[PDB]
C-alpha cells in the first residue's frame, strides 16, 4: 500500500492509482503523460474551462474522454482507465486535484520533499543554495528524501521570509516580528 497517506480527499483516487501503477511501475510515465495531455487539454479553451464546469452529462463526458484519448495514447493505461472512471464518476474538475496528489505520491515514492522559501522578494542565488544546504545539513531533510526548494515571492508578506518544509517552519519575517511589536505598543 502507499508509503504515505494524504488522507484521501480525492487522494483516495491517487492512492489507488499509486499502488496499481506502482506495481505496474509506470508512475513516472503516467505522471508526465498526464501532465502533458493536461497541458494541451487545458489549452483547449472549451473543455479546459468547461472541463472544470459540470455542464457535461454522463454521456457527454464519455465523449469528452474519447477526445482526450485522441490527444495522446499510452503512458500507463491505468490512468487511461482512470479517465473513463473519472468521467463516469462525473468528476473532471478535481482531475487536476488528483494530478497534483499523484505527483506528490509519485515523488514520495522517489523520496523527494518539496520545500518553499516564501519571501517578499526574489532572493540571492547564494541565499537559495545556503538554505538548500542548511536544510540538508539539518536532519529535517533526511537522506533519500530529496529537496526541491522553491523560493516564492509573495507581496502579502512584507519583508523577510519563512522557510517551510517538514510541516515545520521557521518564520523569520519582518511582517510577523512587526505584528508582535505593534501589538505590545498598542497594549
Amino acid at each position: 500500500p502507499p508509503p504515505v497517506r494524504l488522507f484521501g480527499v480525492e487522494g483516495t483516487y491517487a492512492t489507488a492509482l499509486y499502488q496499481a501503477a506502482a506495481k505496474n511501475s509506470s508512475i513516472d510515465a503516467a505522471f508526465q503523460s498526464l501532465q502533458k495531455v493536461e497541458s494541451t487539454v487545458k489549452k483547449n479553451p472549451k473543455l479546459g474551462h468547461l472541463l472544470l464546469n459540470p455542464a457535461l452529462s454522463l454521456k457527454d463526458r464519455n465523449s469528452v474522454i474519447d477526445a482526450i484519448v485522441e490527444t495522446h495514447k499510452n503512458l500507463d493505461g491505468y490512468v487511461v482507465n482512470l479517465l473513463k472512471v473519472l468521467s463516469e464518476n462525473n468528476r473532471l474538475g478535481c482531475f487536476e486535484k488528483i494530478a497534483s496528489d499523484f505527483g506528490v505520491l509519485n515523488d514520495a515514492h522517489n523520496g523527494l520533499l518539496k520545500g518553499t522559501v516564501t519571501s517578499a522578494e526574489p532572493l540571492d542565488p547564494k541565499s537559495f543554495k545556503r538554505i538548500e544546504k542548511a536544510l540538508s545539513a539539518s536532519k529535517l531533510v533526511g537522506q533519500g528524501k530529496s529537496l526541491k526548494l522553491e523560493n516564492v515571492v509573495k507581496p502579502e508578506i512584507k519583508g523577510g521570509l519563512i522557510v517551510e518544509l517538514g510541516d515545520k517552519t521557521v518564520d523569520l519575517s519582518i511582517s510577523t516580528k512587526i505584528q508582535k511589536l505593534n501589538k505590545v505598543l498598542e497594549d
Partner: protein, 114 residues
C-alpha cells in the same frame, strides 16, 4: 417507446430507473416494468437527473432484480370506465377483484387529473 431503462435501485416501493436515452418520461408519467409479477405500474415523481428518475411504485415491490428493463407507458395511467364500473370492485390497476372480468371501456381517464 425508445424510452427504456433498467432499474438502478429498489429502495422500498420507490424504485429508481435509469433510462438509457435522453428522451425521458415527465412527472406523473407512467412506466410499466415487465417482471414475472406481470407488469408493475409505477409513476415517475422526481427526475433525479442524468436520465435517472425516482418513481413511486403503485404496484407492490419485492423479488425485483436490479437492472430490470423498463418501458415508458406515459402520463397518468388511464383506467377503463363506464357505467360498467358500477357493480365492480376494482384494484388499483382497475381490474375487477370481484372478478366479473374486465370493465367495458367507454372513456378511459388518467388517474391524475386537474
Amino acid at each position: 417507446t425508445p424510452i427504456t431503462g433498467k432499474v438502478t435501485a429498489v429502495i422500498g416501493a420507490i424504485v429508481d430507473v435509469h433510462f438509457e436515452q435522453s428522451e425521458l418520461p415527465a412527472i406523473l408519467n407512467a412506466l410499466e416494468i415487465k417482471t414475472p409479477q406481470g407488469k408493475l405500474v409505477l409513476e415517475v415523481a422526481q427526475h433525479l437527473g442524468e436520465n435517472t428518475v425516482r418513481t413511486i411504485a403503485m404496484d407492490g415491490t419485492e423479488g425485483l432484480v436490479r437492472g430490470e428493463k423498463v418501458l415508458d407507458t406515459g402520463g397518468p395511467i388511464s383506467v377503463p370506465v363506464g357505467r360498467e364500473t358500477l357493480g365492480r370492485i376494482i384494484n388499483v390497476i382497475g381490474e375487477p377483484i370481484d372478478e366479473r372480468g374486465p370493465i367495458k371501456s367507454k372513456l378511459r381517464k388518467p388517474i391524475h387529473a386537474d
